[PDB]
């Protein structure tokens with residue numbers, strides 16, 4: 001698809017067997033999801049942005065389906081007000097910026 | 100151009116008489132620049148990111164050039180570590196996400 005930016009690029013995703021929306025975010029190095037339960041091991045990490053830092057649980061090898069495209073990578077789960085798809089997954093779905 | 104996302108989507112911009120690198124940021128509603136002077140009498144504005152909210156300065160009617168594409172709009176200035184080009188400007192230069 002081609003997505004214009006008059007509105008936030010919020011798209012349907014599937015993760016952990018659940019339908020969610022997430023922001024296709026070219027300004028995010030990493031993928032950061034709203035607090036949710038995922039099974040298995042994780043490691044404590046912190047990530048920084050405009051407000052300072054938040055603490056997140058880092059999960060590896062998480063599958064996310066993004067507009068029907070599969071991506072697998074590292075996902076951080078924590079107190080973000082928006083699910084963020086970062087560049088680690090955007091490259092896997094062949095996402096580019098064009099102008 | 101077509102910009103892949105293996106690395107940060109940094110491009111050169113011109114603003115306030117200064118050449119700078121900035122992030123083409125689809126996850127940003129607004130454009131936020133590192134501490135600098137801009138012409139005009141600013142208004143206060145709150146913006147929110149990972150880590151919470153910060154208070155920044157809003158300058159309206161600011162000229163910016165982004166890879167040869169001229170734009171005019173509102174630009175925020177505050178304690179960001181990276182110059183961020185947000186959707187308010189990305190739409191003006193005809194920038195889309197594609198996959």
Ligand SMILES: CC(C)[C@H](NC(=O)[C@H](C)NC(=O)OCc1ccccc1)C(=O)N[C@@H](Cc1ccccc1)[C@@H](O)[C@H](O)[C@H](Cc1ccccc1)NC(=O)[C@@H](NC(=O)[C@H](C)NC(=O)OCc1ccccc1)C(C)C
Pocket residue numbers: 025026027028029030031032047048049050051052053080081082084086124125126127128129130131145146147148149150179180181183185
């Ligand atoms: C999502 C993260 C992985 C992320 N950071 C990274 O990729 C790397 C690992 N971080 C990094 O390099 O951090 C270094 C450092 C360390 C300490 C503190 C400062 C910075 C990031 O925050 N990326 C942001 C840009 C940036 C990148 C590097 C360093 C600093 C910030 C935006 O691209 C990203 O798209 C976020 C997503 C977001 C939305 C809101 C809450 C949580 C996450 N957008 C934003 O931060 C923008 N906010 C918005 O667009 C919000 C949604 N709108 C808004 O504030 O509108 C005004 C409004 C407020 C209140 C009422 C009325 C209107 C901001 C740049 C303007």
Ligand SMILES: COc1ccc(Br)c(OC)c1C(=O)O
Pocket residue numbers: 043044045046055056057
């Ligand atoms: C550095 O500290 C953390 C980072 C991520 C997480 Br998740 C943490 O646990 C809540 C902690 C901590 O031990 O407080």
Ligand SMILES: COc1ccc(Br)c(OC)c1C(=O)O
Pocket residue numbers: 081082146147148
């Ligand atoms: C009013 O919309 C927002 C503005 C800034 C931020 Br930060 C928001 O959180 C993601 C929201 C929102 O929850 O929709």
